[model samples]
Target chain A: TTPWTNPGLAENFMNSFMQGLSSMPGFTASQLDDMSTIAQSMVQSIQSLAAQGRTSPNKLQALNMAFASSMAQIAASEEGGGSLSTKTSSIASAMSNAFLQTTGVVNQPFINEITQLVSMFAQAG
Target chain B: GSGNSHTTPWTNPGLAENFMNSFMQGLSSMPGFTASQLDDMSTIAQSMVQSIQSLAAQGRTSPNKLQALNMAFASSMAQIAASEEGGGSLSTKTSSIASAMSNAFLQTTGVVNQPFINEITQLVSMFAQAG
Candidate 1:
């Protein structure tokens, strides 16, 4: 399976992830949307890279940087404070599901890096 | 006044024709938003459409404008979510909205990402019934 055969599968994961976050135990639309902004931007880059059929390590590093930077920004913001700490587990879980579902088929290395990075950020935060 | 005759050509009819009913519908379907919250979001979304219409009428449709509009709409949606009783806290909710928009835009490709362009595409594709 060439994985990228149907980008929609990866996209479905992203959609499901965002929708799930929207209704989590202590979630508010604001924080969910904020999380979406960060994750979505990274995923956008990932999609763009996937389309190019090129997965440079530099691109992966850049994606992680963006991911980390937004997390830090969210952590510092008034919105991200306490709730962020609580939501880490949920985000990690969601990331894992999306990663597991799509890793075998599309952009494996990048997906692997993001899955790991999400865990690192969730725990480190 | 010379300002009366200052006219411009519509550079992007593609944007002007993009309808937003489906986009608002997709957003409304997102969980956790109260009915009222969705109403507010619809209002904000309509405003976004109007702004785009204004720009199209003025012949100024551009990607940069659309990006800013997206952030603005997300900000507006977050504000609505924060005010409701069961909605999440302000900061968190806003952050979520930002993140959602970020992801939504990522799902789009080969487009300027005008407020509802992706939604339009998704709706069409999703509704592709045998005709």
Candidate 2:
């Protein structure tokens, strides 16, 4: 199905994710606001990837890299999550239940995606 | 005039801004922080010190309030760490498809991940409605 079919859920997820995510450890209101703006835009990338999946191994690798970089950011800063990586996962996780429900999977895939995302960093660094 | 602690921005302008700037630089150097984040941190620290200074200049803050503020910072830092480790308004499920995606949390999914996705997305999407 096309991603535009129910942007309501996606929209809601975005709003909620930002509200909850922005206040994490060490973040300031201004930082949260900036993070929210970036995350909201990030949804466009997600929609493109979600509906299309990976078109090529390289694309998959890019996804892995993007995903991992986000995780590693979160791992390093347990609070405030001022990094894009941290914000993405929080948003992604919030969006996860939706994606999982839409695709019919469980929580493990989320873990796997993040784990692999984290791994890409290991290999790169 | 006497100077404040090197670490506490509230004690002095150059030292405080300097400390905050240093943290901003360090975190900015960290792999995950975005340029946007550094900007926000700079703004936040600037505001925090400004607020403290304005009150200190006016002597609007009482001794009790000063003690309270001091306690607040230490207490807040602890709470911040604890919450970061435990709070979760976001929880993602795992998934796999004929396409490129994979699971994020769930280790098992024999049927369809669509339901979990829908629920999580709906929950996240509509969270503001509750507030």
Candidate 3:
């Protein structure tokens, strides 16, 4: 099924995901709002890629990379910026998990690319 | 702010709208979830979230904490699944929900380390299979 065709799919998944974390400590209202904005940007990026008829694996890789880069920027500006590598890997895993949960699909190639990107970012950091 | 253009635009913002109400509503809307089951699952989910946040607050990104978290999640899921008609389906759905929720928080907040994320994926995948 073309699950992505449903505009509500992404929003619902994100809504549920965000709501699930609303009660967690250490995060202010402002931070959660920032995440909501970041997530919207990510959805737009993926929609753009999908319009180009990009394959699922390609979309997954691009989305993961974009999220990692975005988070890296946050890490760089924050205290304890030395943990960029760890944060990158964490971002990779989180994005991968979110993709799988949202789309109900994954493959070896996508996994390899995620690992590769994490390694590259770690080394760069 | 370190001249970082990438800093999040933190204008006036509200916390998550409806909070647990929205979360519990989403859970209730999922297929195959009975009210009784949801009660138990909700308790487990809240505990898991609290424990994970505790770990983050303490800066305890050790593998042991991740392992414990994973095991607890898996164990609670396994118990809940035992009472369902299609236990496997329950396991799959619950694990996916857990993964999506936890990973979203981690990624968005940029808490937890690489090893924690890695072990979480590994152990959660294991739970999904063994569930």
Candidate 4:
């Protein structure tokens, strides 16, 4: 069955994920909310691409852009002495893995895309 | 005793693979997991096994390898818990499974940090309880 057929599924999934992340240390409530929004947006973008029958590369690129933007926003929110790069990478990884695990789409290509994107972003920081 | 009696589960390839297989099997019965989601988790588990084997081969400490495993497990569990279907009972079951995984991994790896372990347990539990 097509996974996002139920719109509520994605919302519930993201909400649960954000709540989980909130339970962890380091991230403030505001950051958690921001990350949740970013995650939801990423999911919607992927679903939209799938619905439009876009190519795999297009979808991957879209994911990459979303992730990059998320990192930028997260970095911008930093207030004091902290490893912005590390936090950004960690949150990005968490979000990526959450999406993959929830959707059952942790294919090799998706993994490779995320691995490379994460490495690139980490280096760029 | 062969001077290597202190081998940790994450540091031994056989032990690591066995633990992950056992963990994945346990997750198979959880609520809200589709066949494809299980398959995805299995793939993640395999990668974790590979990471442990590689890191161990490089003479990394068990704690180091365990931290890697923790990150992978935490990420997967957070999403799985969120995506789970059903009401309170099902959520409790999901959280129980997650807590079991976390406790088993920490104990098997000889990690003595009770506070840290408790934090992980609580984090996963919250994820399960979340809507």
Candidate 5:
């Protein structure tokens, strides 16, 4: 729900995602290509996520939230607060809309879980 | 075409020049920053930039994807705004997201400045326009 806040949650997520990604067999050339393509995308996603700062989900969330707040303040104070200048809440709304557009998540996952998934998916092929 | 700045003259524009210019603008936004910060941002945002220097650097980012991402962003931004207000457009909405992400990475310091949060922000935002 709030993304696995537990310390071991990321490691746990990696185990599950990787097992699932690699468990499949009988992959054809096309499937392999697809897997590789997806894998590469997944890898980029994972490294982007994992390589991203914050080993934990909560930290990432906090950092992201902080960034939004700070950016808004700077944008408002510096640029006179136009639509672009004022972000955070509006952008969060956009991200939520995006999630709905992409895959309807049961809940807003912790950012780490997303990275774990990407890591697994990337490593699968 | 092999028409990047490394080879082509300034008369002919290519990914390298476009990349360097965009990168300069992106980093210029941050005042009194470090050279490492700028370089890190460049590597992170490489996906959005095209460069002959990075043609083989897949780990950095896929320049080819950056080319396709433009139309994708424009399309998706239009689509999202129709359904989700002004949040979907890539123009400024995405820039805000990038700014926000940059703050995150910059603050993270040791951990961040590694991935292109802002770059990924742009790519996702463009994909959002298409999504």
Candidate 6:
């Protein structure tokens, strides 16, 4: 019943998101390539979750969990704490906006949760 | 419209003038943003400046309006920049614009200056109010 219960959907969603971000103007080529590394890590995380069946039927919730998991991993990494690089932060902001655009997930509670996670990953030192 | 300073004019009456100049400068530089688009944004910003000038002319200011205006600008700008369709050219330049704006402000002032931020808010307010 979960939206990403089918693992291919997870792959597809992230692939589209990556393409959207890459096509967008703000990021430089270097930033785009750097995002691929983060994206790769996050994709693996998604697959890892699938292996454990960690997903939800609700599209928004499914997305939230996936993004949160990705962010938490990044935040907890050896180099992840304090603040995100300018390029990385920019990518995160862009991704957040893109996600909202596609899903219309603007509820304050969801926003707050996502924002908190993003800030953890990217806020200024 | 005329000021000696490139960044923030310190003169009392010059506040709106300086703000409008810097705000338009950044908005103007957006890639794919047409002169017509800049004109529209300029008109919008000027109207808000008029409001600011009117308040200053009245010998009083709304402390809260300025803060609210700044938040509105950042929020509105962020939303548009992120939107794939609605953000247009500005959306594409989101990161660059943000960096440039911040750098311009920092260079203009020693810090990311409040006056600059306040002025930008005024510009953002015009669109935020309408949207």
Q: State which candidate has the highest TM-score.
A: 4
lDDT of 3 by residue, A1-125 (tens): 22233544544444444454344433346544544544454454445544655424323322333333333333333334235455445544554554566766643343454444435333433
Candidate 1: Cα lDDT at A110 = 38
Off by over 4 Å in 3: A1-35, A44-65, A72-89, A122-125, B1-131
User: For candidate 3, lDDT tens digit of each residue in B1-131?
Assistant: 76343221121011111122234445565555556556655554454444445444555423322332333343344334433444246445555445443443343444424443343344334333433
TM-score of chain A of each: 0.51, 0.39, 0.45, 0.49, 0.30, 0.46
User: Which runs of model 1 end up more than 4 angstroms from their true locations?
Assistant: A1-16, A51-54, A80-84, A104-125, B1-131
Tell how far residue B119 is off in model 3, in angstroms.
28
Which pairs clash inside model 4? none
Note the Cα lDDT for every prediction shown: 0.43, 0.34, 0.41, 0.47, 0.33, 0.42
Candidate 1 lDDT over B15-125, as tens digits, reads 322323344555554555667666655654554455556555766544323333443343334334533445544444444444444444443322334343333222222
lDDT of 6 by residue, B1-131 (tens): 66343233233434434444465577666564445444534443453355446545665433223322322224323333332223354434454345445654554444566443443333233223322
Q: DockQ for all models, in order?
A: 0.02, 0.02, 0.02, 0.05, 0.04, 0.02
In terms of lDDT, the poorest run of 10 residues in model 2 chain B is B93-102
Considering summed lDDT, which 10 consecutive residues are worst modelled in model 1 chain B?
Answer: B122-131
Q: TM-score for candidate 3, please give it.
A: 0.29
Model 2 Cα lDDT, one tens digit per residue, A6-120: 4344444445545655545445564454444334433444454446542222222222222223333333333443454544455456445544444344345434544443333
Q: Which candidate is the best by DockQ?
A: 4
Native contacts recovered, each model: 0.00, 0.00, 0.00, 0.00, 0.00, 0.00
Off by over 4 Å in 5: A2-35, A48-125, B1-24, B27-55, B58-131
Interface RMSD for model 6 amounts to 18.3
* Full candidate order by lDDT, most accurate first: 4, 1, 6, 3, 2, 5
Candidate topping lDDT: 4
TM-score of each: 0.33, 0.26, 0.29, 0.40, 0.27, 0.34
